[PDB]
C-alpha cells in the first residue's frame, strides 16, 4: 500500500492544569481504539469533564476542540481513588466515539463526533509546524502544570494537617501566591519552605 487512512493529529483529553493528555497518537492508523484510566483532581470530586481535543501542542487551549461532556454521579472520594476509564474509538468511517466510565458507580457517558470535524489540511500543517516550533516552549508548560498540580494538592493536603501554624499558614499563602505564577522553581521553592515549618506536625 502506498496509501492509508490515519487520524491526522494527536487526539486526547484535557487534564488538570490544562494540559492535553493524549489517547491516540497522530498518524495512527484507523480504525484505532484506545483506552486510558483517569482519576479525580480534587478530593470528594463528584463529577468530571471530558473534553476531546485535536492537535499536538501541550496546552489544551491550543488544541482543537471536538466536543465535551460530563460524567456525573461519582462517589465523593479522595483524589486519585476513582477509576475513570476513558476510551477513544475511531471506526472505519473516521467516526470518533469517546466514552468515560466510573468503575464504581458504573455511571457512563459517551460522545459521538463527526468525521468532518477537527483540523483541515492548512490547519494541520500549522498545528505541527507550530508544535515543534514551540517544542522547548511546551515542555515548559509541562513541568509547570506538573508542579502547580503538585503544590495544589499540598496547599490542599497540608491545610488539614494543622505556632508553627501561624507559620504554616504563611507558607500556604506563599505557595498559593506562587502557584499562580509561571515560575516553577519558585512555586517549588515555596513548597520547599512549607516542607520545613510543617515538620513539627509530623514530629
Amino acid at each position: 500500500v502506498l496509501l492509508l487512512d490515519v487520524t491526522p493529529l494527536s487526539l486526547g483529553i484535557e487534564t488538570m492544569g490544562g494540559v492535553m493528555t493524549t489517547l491516540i497518537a497522530k498518524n495512527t492508523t484507523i480504525p484505532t481504539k484506545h483506552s486510558q484510566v483517569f482519576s479525580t483532581a480534587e478530593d470528594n470530586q463528584s463529577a468530571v469533564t471530558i473534553h476531546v481535543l485535536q492537535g499536538e501542542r501541550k496546552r489544551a487551549a491550543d488544541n482543537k476542540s471536538l466536543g465535551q461532556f460530563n460524567l456525573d454521579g461519582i462517589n465523593p472520594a479522595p483524589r486519585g481513588m476513582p477509576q475513570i476509564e476513558v476510551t477513544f474509538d475511531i471506526d472505519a468511517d473516521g467516526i470518533l466515539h469517546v466514552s468515560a466510565k466510573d468503575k464504581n458507580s458504573g455511571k457512563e457517558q459517551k460522545i459521538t463526533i463527526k468525521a468532518s470535524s477537527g483540523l483541515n489540511e492548512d490547519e494541520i500543517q500549522k498545528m505541527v509546524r507550530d508544535a515543534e516550533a514551540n517544542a522547548e516552549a511546551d515542555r515548559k508548560f509541562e513541568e509547570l502544570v506538573q508542579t502547580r498540580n503538585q503544590g495544589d494538592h499540598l496547599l490542599h493536603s497540608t491545610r488539614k494537617q494543622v505556632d508553627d501554624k501561624t507559620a504554616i499558614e504563611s507558607a500556604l499563602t506563599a505557595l498559593e501566591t506562587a502557584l499562580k505564577g509561571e515560575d516553577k522553581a519558585a512555586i517549588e521553592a515555596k513548597m520547599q519552605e512549607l516542607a520545613q515549618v510543617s515538620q513539627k506536625l509530623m514530629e
Binding site: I13, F38, A41, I84
Partner: peptide, 9 residues
C-alpha cells in the same frame, strides 16, 4: 502513570 481531570464548570 495516571492523570487527573477537573470538575465541570
Amino acid at each position: 502513570k495516571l492523570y487527573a481531570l477537573p470538575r465541570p464548570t
